[PDB]
Amino acid sequence: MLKKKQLTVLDLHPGAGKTRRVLPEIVREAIKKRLRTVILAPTRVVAAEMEEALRGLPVRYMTTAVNVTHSGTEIVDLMCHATFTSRLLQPIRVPNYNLNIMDEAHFTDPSSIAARGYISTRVEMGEAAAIFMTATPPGTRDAFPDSNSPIMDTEVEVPERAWSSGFDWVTDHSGKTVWFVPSVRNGNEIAACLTKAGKRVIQLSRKTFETEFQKTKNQEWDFVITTDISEMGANFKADRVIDSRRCLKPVILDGERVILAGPMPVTHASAAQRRGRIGRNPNKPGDEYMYGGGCAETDEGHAHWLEARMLLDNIYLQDGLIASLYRPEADKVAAIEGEFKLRTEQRKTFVELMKRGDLPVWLAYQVASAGITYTDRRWCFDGTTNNTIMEDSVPAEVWTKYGEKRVLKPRWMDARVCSDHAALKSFKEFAAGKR
Ligand SMILES: CCOc1ccccc1N1CCNCC1
């Protein structure tokens, strides 16, 4: 696997031991061969699990998620997928790693797709090796892969709203359930219903994931209500998954605005990863997978692959060359390669809007490419009337950094800045000049 120009898809089924058994063997071999190696974890939670899998191997944990004292001599680095792409974009030295290992390599956040594009391009140039670890490579059509123990698969109507009757099977269960919902707001409504029925519920989403995931270890629970973030190596002591089989798809309309379309069907890869939360213990056969819809290839025209092109157009590779998306997922976007390349100062603005600004990639790009500087928030208030953002059925208002109360009405409207209360609070802080 470790030879130059080799990209290996380590596609063992979910729970087959890719992270805990195979990865430490790869790392031992890499160190013996003096290969400068990077290991990419999708989340801080997985970074900390990897330290346990790799204990007593000389690895530099480029994350505050791991409490370790480095020797200073490590030739293996571990960081998050997002950290890798972030450091490529910034004026910071990133080693040309001989071996590039991506764990949970199916992750479809923009920074993960961009990282696969960069790594697979360096391999194709003949510079590097890569290992992509996932049960569900891009374009997999199998929602029901093999497991450590037999799963009971049942197609059934799954509630997506509060219910009073007609779903007794949901609450009659005495075990632990992981329930995948299409959005934070949908999970809130289902969580409230379950809580009202006397169940202990933990809610997970991207922003809350590290803090709330610890509650799955520290407290007794009946249900975990999660968005698709739990597709990325989240492990639970569960015996049932309830899967809406639904997700939100960010869609760019008319090059002008981003909407959160759907909910609509998940991909096969997503469904297999959701199911893959259970069936993991060979001594516990008959974990249950209840699924409420079919799969479709909803990644086609999904904004994350356009956003991945915005990131890759702004990463130095060699002279004016630009990394291609990883071939199996390259048809998910219609972009002109290089169309999003920014000059040095606009790139710096673009990076700062994503990092400190915490804006979606697409929205950061519209602002930076318009020649607006990071702290200039005039654009948050000068959009068209249909761009008015709502809070409790009235226009959302902030006090500007000038001390003027203004309606939130961004010149470029991205539905992800107000898809839930937390997002809207963050965007209101931004529009007010508070970060
Ligand atoms: C932004 C944090 O990234 C780093 C970058 C390089 C090496 C180590 C670290 N940290 C991680 C946090 N503190 C421990 C070591």
Curated annotation (Swiss-Prot):
A motif (DEAH box) lies at residues 103-106. Residues 150-329 form the Helicase C-terminal domain. It comes from the Viruses. ATP binds at residues 12-19. It is found in: Host cytoplasm; Host endoplasmic reticulum membrane. Residues 1-155 form the Helicase ATP-binding domain. The modification N6-acetyllysine is found at residue 207. This is Serine protease NS3. It comes from Zika virus (ZIKV). The lineage of its organism: Viruses, Riboviria, Orthornavirae, Kitrinoviricota, Flasuviricetes.
